[PDB]
Design a protein around this ligand. Structure first.
Ligand SMILES: Nc1ncnc2c1ncn2[C@@H]1O[C@H](COP(=O)(O)OP(=O)(O)O)[C@@H](O)[C@H]1O
Ligand SMILES: Nc1ncnc2c1ncn2[C@@H]1O[C@H](COP(=O)(O)OP(=O)(O)O)[C@@H](O)[C@H]1O
Ligand SMILES: Nc1ncnc2c1ncn2[C@@H]1O[C@H](COP(=O)(O)OP(=O)(O)O)[C@@H](O)[C@H]1O
Ligand SMILES: [Mg+2]
Ligand SMILES: [Mg+2]
Ligand SMILES: [Mg+2]
Ligand SMILES: [Mg+2]
Ligand SMILES: [Mg+2]
Lengths: 223, 434, 430, 433
């Protein structure tokens, strides 16, 4: 069932409906009688077949749980560096901009099976300090998910050693604060800060136009 | 990383807007007439009006006929359907070669359609008859943003009984097709049991009823197989309809008349657009005389598009005939409706640019002395022997830890590997059939 | 709206003959071949007469003469309601089907049967619908009102009228047209509809069905599935004999009238001798359609025997058949054919390009010029003008080579091309 | 371990036996001699182990008793696991239900495999007690049991399918289970005290599973549902090429997404001389495809007439096949190498031989053939075994020589007795006078 469920992809994209009824002769009007189709449809209705997995797998192409990381260019090398930081014994922070990547990142982190805690504007005030002290103390939580405006401005997280940026709109002072939440007084290990920039996109033009202009301020991205 | 097998160095013909072909452009050196004339064939397929035109490519080995076939197949683009085919492949024992030949003529053509379908999804609340019955089931799908109840056919209800769903399971139901997929138990019942084989999926966001439009392309031969035999279904009558007679048969002309009748009705509604394609037949000299004589009437037919042939012979005997001697292995009536594009050979410097550009695509570094030696082997043994020996020189460079191809590596390739004429010269001297 | 792109046989529409059967020089796409078009008009009035049967005709000639185009003109001038079967000579060779029974299948496919009957129809606008059923029992009781310009009445409905009325959605504004014998409903328009006339009218319906369809239908029940899927073959002849007596009884009773169709076989030269003797018997049957043959080859050896029979056919076939021959064309008729192909392809040509295209059409062939007229408009189209110049015809001549020129190139380059014994010089030196 | 291995002609050859500089040793890994053939075969071995190139055909030719099939056996043995190797015959493609071209395409799809990996969770621990709860009339079972290990001991409540698999398959408190969450099936591995079980480690662990599947299997599976029954019963054939084209774009998309990695396998065809010209031109096209494995051919015949044509083409193959292929040739062996091969066949067959029996067996191996001596070494230990000693004497080799006759000796006996044997025209003298 696993090889069938994983290796059956293609679908017969062209079909004619109501041809299955006519090929056997059982329809609303035919040369056969009235309860031939009824007794045949009932004896068919009782008899089962073990090929229903291949039938349902071949009728509709199943968009299974694996395509969360394969449809995203940023999620291709993200799990590789999370495995590399897992094997080296490091903790990481993730800072995003909008909340629509937070639930997708929660489904990805639940897919790869780590221990995480999310902090954003949808949480309460009571769970915030307990979720802060849970990550600051020695635990098994590797990744701690935050946001830019809510939890990446004034907290004192000294546990993590890695900052991961998915997207950065404003970076003369604003994105510097998010990576400065990690680097604090209570850190004795060096901070490795990564950044996710795509290829031949707008984000590829932002840092390329900012490298020549020494990264003062961006106005209009046009290329 | 990147697999290169006698191809992938050609990104098309590489012609200008005026028509004049460059000397070095797009993995091609020389061959101006076949590339520019091949671009005239490319525009001829881009006309979407011509049909019945047959242009064979005749030449010797290592001259660039199949490379020109990948040049026109790459110059047309993915939107134009390309059907690679060999004349040795048309022999079949299930049906005749006529059905495979005319069927391939229906395989070359394409037709893109646009259609909208309805999408229903939600958590199953009640499975109950209406109030009185003949056994139908109202399925109350609880989505996130809405709650709606719908009445279904007994066949899709039978597939619902097949999926073993219950109260509180997220399903996926398509309106026009009737296929049923289960996503899993909803997240509200995750705390009912501590361990369960059924995975827990969240509730689907959005409405209950959803619509979208697809620009899906599907070939006309795929519509012919869809008009010929039953493919599959989820019921017993459809699966036994498949299992009873799945052996493919010949197709009558009236079936194609109804297929292109409703296809012509779809192009009268403005929904679809008819685009011709390319059937490329390899090794036409291997064809029988029956396929040639059906190609005579088949090129007189209407839907036969621009077909490109490739024959590598001359005044030889046709297969299936005893005394008939004709050029290219093609009968003179089929050769009269054919168009011949003569292929030009290559000099020593052009062999040097073939080995050079093939070496740059192969990402190997060749020194100038080994480049001139591979040029002399290109002008002594063959082109395919030098292109065949590009890789073992880099292998011996890897074993000798060198990054460039040297004289001793290609001479060691001359000692470890022999060409045609050394093999014949060795096999001329025999003690007991050497 | 028969599907019509640009074919080689698209411009020929009808035979183009007068009432005295003398053909015009330019008429209905066919120019030249006066005797072939006149004799083909004799075949046309032979099918239109229908009093005789069991006759075979043959159209022969050299290539680029249009014997297939002449039979296309006969099939186009034949009109509708008459069956025309155009099969290939190598089409009868099959593995699941025998060649003789497939030839008998074509001989049954050529002739059709017209059967007519009368049915009643009630078409009128719906005012309101008032059905009546029960929450537990069933037994629906339908009532609705049908209205037209001069009639407005309430019709009570039965069980099957509410079965078809509830399996197919309909409204008060929606307008139906009901057949009494068929029992199915035609929901035509809603309040398209704008109807006139009487409410209940009776009209006649006519159906055309060939004898092959009745043969596979009366073979077995799954012969209808074999009629669509094509998995038929080797029918018992008791269906053919009792179907022949049943068709003759339908002709004697006046119920069913038949239409004598035409059977056209393309490339009849490479046919088996068993099919030859089978035609030699089957031409003498009662229900035997007019057969037109196009022998395309020359004098050679017939398939199935060792001797070289003349014409590629045995003399038993050619004894009971008539033969029409075609001749070559003049220089002016090639220019006229290229002019009417310019009118069919919607291509505007110049005078000098038509003269040079006529000269290279005389020198090489008709088909090469008939494709150079197509590509010349596109070499002209790359220069962004619709006018075709002589430079486009010269470029299209030097690019697209003739068969005899590359025969000279093959004979000059025989070391390059592979020989009969498989020897080939794939190198340059030594 | 435990691939089924009796004494074969190709059993002693285990690996190619080459050094890091690809120069072959005289005696290494069962292969003695043929330095250029083993070095070039090592170039093919690192060509498969490189995997950056494809669409290449090679040919191994030579006289009989040279071991070109043994050289390809050494390449397949030095190839190792996880790489598919397809060894088919030249006359195997001729079938009545299957066309020869589509069977050759089936072999070309059988040669290349795909590795796909995923991660699953597993809970393994000792059971303390089981306490299910159902009803005598209603149903709706409610299971509870306790799972214990060295550092964890907890009670797990069960669902409906856990009691379905827990009652379909008999289990006890003493019996120990290992449950996968995604699969839902139970592994009753061991039992406690009167089994194996003695477990360590954590309770719930996640491990990765890797599956290897060739492209031909995906081709017949994506053909239809009963293509799996045709995958086991072998009633497949003549698949539509839309499965091959959309499967090629799907495999290329899986390579672009990084989900599925493929392994370039080797296609070996034995006795390729008697092949049809349609398969020859089909190889001439199919060698230029993108997903084209490395093809090794062993042309075994001589110069003769090709099947399907009338002319005598050289090599038994057309030049279009031999133009795009590389050719390795083998030579005859010396007198010492036959004694070395018979010595390593004595080591493979576990046969103790004397020096004089090895010298006379080497002489009759030089005179007649390699195979006759390679069977006389087998029967000589049994003529020795009838004398109840393991030592092989020269009398056993002489008796095995006078009993088992060579082909040329009975050719002389046939030519001396042509009146006894039946002639070409069926004439035979079955009488004496
Ligand atoms: N003009 C050219 N430029 C570059 N490479 C060429 C050219 N002509 C031929 N080749 C190379 O020669 C190889 C074999 O030629 P091929 O097309 O197989 O010849 P044929 O069509 O006669 O069999 C191809 O891989 C192609 O890359
Ligand atoms: N009388 C005619 N009028 C118009 N076109 C003709 C005529 N005769 C021949 N042709 C041309 O000849 C071509 C086809 O010749 P065809 O019928 O195939 O010859 P054959 O039957 O001998 O092979 C068509 O493109 C058609 O335009
Ligand atoms: N290099 C070698 N090392 C050991 N044994 C060999 C070697 N070459 C050939 N042989 C022997 O040759 C036999 C195989 O011969 P084979 O290759 O079948 O002959 P052919 O080439 O005529 O098919 C095997 O029994 C094997 O022991
Ligand atoms: Mg502060
Ligand atoms: Mg080729
Ligand atoms: Mg003709
Ligand atoms: Mg007679
Ligand atoms: Mg062998």
């Amino acid at each position: 069932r696993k090889i069938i469920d994983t290796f059956a992809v293609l679908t017969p994209s062209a079909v004619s409906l109501d041809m299955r009824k006519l090929a056997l002769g059982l329809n609303d009007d035919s040369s056969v009688g009235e309860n031939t189709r009824l007794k045949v449809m009932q004896n068919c209705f009782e008899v089962s077949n073990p090929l229903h997995q291949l039938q349902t797998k071949l009728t509709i192409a199943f968009p299974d749980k694996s395509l969360l990381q394969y449809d995203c260019g940023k999620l291709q090398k993200l799990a590789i560096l999370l495995q590399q930081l897992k094997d080296n014994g490091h903790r990481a922070l993730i800072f995003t901009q909008m909340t629509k990547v937070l639930d997708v990142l929660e489904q990805f982190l639940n897919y790869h099976g780590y221990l995480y805690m999310r902090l954003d504007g949808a949480t309460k005030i009571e769970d915030r300090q307990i979720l802060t002290e849970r990550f600051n103390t020695d635990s098994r939580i590797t990744v701690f998910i935050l946001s830019s405006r809510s939890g990446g401005l004034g907290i004192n997280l000294t546990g993590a050693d890695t900052v991961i940026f998915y997207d950065s709109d404003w970076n003369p002072a604003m994105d510097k604060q998010c990576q400065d939440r990690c680097h604090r007084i209570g850190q004795t290990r060096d901070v490795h800060i990564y950044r996710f920039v795509s290829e031949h996109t707008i984000e590829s033009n932002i840092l390329k136009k900012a490298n020549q202009k020494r990264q003062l301020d961006n106005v209009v991205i046009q290329e | 990383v990147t697999r290169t097998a006698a191809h992938t160095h050609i990104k098309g013909l590489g012609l200008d807007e005026s028509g004049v072909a460059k000397r070095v452009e797009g993995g091609f050196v020389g061959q101006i007439e076949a590339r520019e004339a091949c671009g005239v064939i490319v525009d001829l397929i881009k006309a979407k009006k011509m049909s019945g035109r047959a242009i064979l490519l005749a030449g010797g080995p290592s001259t660039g006929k199949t490379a020109l076939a990948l040049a026109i197949s790459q110059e047309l683009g993915p939107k134009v359907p390309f059907c690679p085919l060999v004349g040795s492949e048309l022999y079949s024992v299930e049906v005749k070669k006529t059905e495979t030949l005319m069927e391939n003529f229906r395989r070359a053509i394409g037709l893109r359609i646009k259609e909208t379908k309805e999408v229903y999804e939600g958590e199953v609340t009640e499975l109950t008859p209406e109030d009185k019955t003949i056994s139908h089931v109202i399925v109350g799908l609880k989505s996130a943003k809405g709650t709606k109840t719908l009445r279904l056919d007994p066949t899709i209800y039978e597939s619902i009984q097949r999926e073993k769903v219950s109260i509180g399971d997220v399903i996926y139901i398509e309106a026009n097709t009737g296929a049923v997929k289960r996503v899993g138990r909803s997240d509200a019942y995750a705390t009912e049991f501590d361990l369960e084989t059924e995975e827990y999926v969240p509730l689907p966001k959005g409405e209950v009823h959803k619509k979208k439009e697809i620009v899906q392309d599907v070939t006309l031969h795929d519509l012919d197989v869809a008009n010929a035999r039953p493919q599959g279904g989820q019921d017993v009558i459809s699966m036994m309809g498949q299992l009873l007679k799945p052996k493919k048969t010949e197709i009558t002309e009236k079936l194609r008349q109804e297929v292109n009748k409703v296809v012509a009705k779809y192009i009268d509604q403005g929904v679809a657009e008819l685009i011709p394609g390319v059937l490329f037949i390899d090794e036409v000299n291997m064809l029988d005389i029956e396929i040639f004589t059906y190609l005579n009437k088949a090129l007189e037919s209407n839907i036969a598009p621009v077909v490109v042939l490739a024959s590598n012979r001359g005044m030889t005997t046709v297969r299936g005939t005893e005394d008939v001697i004709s050029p290219h292995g093609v009968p003179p009536d089929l050769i009269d409706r054919l168009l011949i594009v003569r292929t030009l050979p290559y000099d020593k410097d052009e062999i040097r640019t073939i080995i050079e550009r093939r070496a740059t695509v192969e990402r190997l570094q060749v020194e100038s002395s080994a480049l001139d030696l591979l040029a002399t082997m290109g002008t002594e043994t063959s082109l395919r022997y030098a292109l065949q020996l590009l890789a073992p020189c880099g292998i011996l460079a890897q074993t000798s830890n060198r990054k460039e191809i040297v004289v001793n590596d290609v001479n060691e390739a001359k000692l470890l590997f022999l060409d045609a004429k050394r093999s014949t010269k060795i096999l001329e001297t025999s003690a007991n059939y050497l | 709206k028969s599907l019509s792109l640009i074919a080689a046989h698209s411009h020929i529409t009808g035979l183009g003959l007068d009432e005295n059967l003398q053909p015009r020089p330019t008429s209905e796409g066919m120019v030249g071949q006066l005797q072939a078009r006149r004799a083909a008009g004799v075949i046309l009035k032979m099918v239109q007469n229908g009093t005789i049967a069991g006759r075979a005709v043959l159209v022969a000639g050299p290539p680029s003469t249009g014997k297939t185009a002449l039979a296309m003109g006969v099939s186009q001038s034949l009109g509708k309601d008459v069956p025309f079967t155009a099969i290939a000579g190598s089409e009868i060779f099959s593995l699941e089907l025998s060649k003789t029974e497939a030839l008998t299948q074509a001989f049954r496919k050529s002739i059709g049967i017209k059967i007519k009957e009368e049915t009643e129809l009630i078409e009128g606008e719906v005012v309101e619908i008032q059905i009546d059923r029960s929450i537990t029992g069933g037994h629906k009781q339908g009532k609705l009102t049908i209205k037209t310009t001069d009639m407005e009445t309430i019709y009570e409905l039965g069980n099957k009228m509410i079965d078809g009325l509830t399996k197919e959605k309909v409204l008060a504004g929606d307008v139906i047209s009901i057949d009494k014998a068929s029992g199915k409903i035609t929901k035509l328009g809603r309040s398209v509809q704008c109807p006139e006339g009487e409410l209940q009218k009776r009209k006649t319906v006519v159906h055309t069905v060939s004898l092959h369809e009745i043969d596979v239908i009366n073979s077995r029940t799954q012969g209808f599935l074999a009629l669509f899927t094509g998995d038929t073959g080797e029918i018992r002849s008791e269906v053919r004999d009792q179907i022949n007596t049943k068709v003759a009884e339908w002709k004697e009773e006046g119920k069913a009238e038949i239409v004598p169709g035409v059977l056209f076989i393309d490339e009849v030269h490479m046919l088996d001798i068993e099919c030859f003797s089978f035609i030699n018997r089957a031409l003498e049957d009662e229900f035997a359609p007019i057969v037109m043959m196009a022998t395309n080859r020359g004098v050679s050896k017939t398939r199935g025997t060792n001797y070289k029979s003349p014409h590629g056919l045995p003399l038993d076939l050619l004894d009971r058949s008539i033969i029409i021959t075609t001749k070559s064309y003049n220089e002016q008729e090639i220019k006229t054919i290229l002019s009417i192909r310019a009118q069919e392809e919607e291509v505007e040509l110049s005078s000098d390009a038509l003269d040079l295209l006529t000269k290279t059409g005389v020198e090489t062939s008709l088909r090469y010029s008939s494709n150079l007229i197509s590509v010349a408009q596109q070499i002209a189209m790359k220069r962004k003008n619709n006018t075709v110049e002589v430079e486009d015809v010269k470029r299209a001549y030097l690019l697209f080579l003739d068969s005899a020129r590359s025969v000279k190139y093959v004979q000059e380059n025989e070391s390059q091309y592979i020989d009969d014994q498989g020897n080939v010089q794939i190198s340059i030196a030594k």
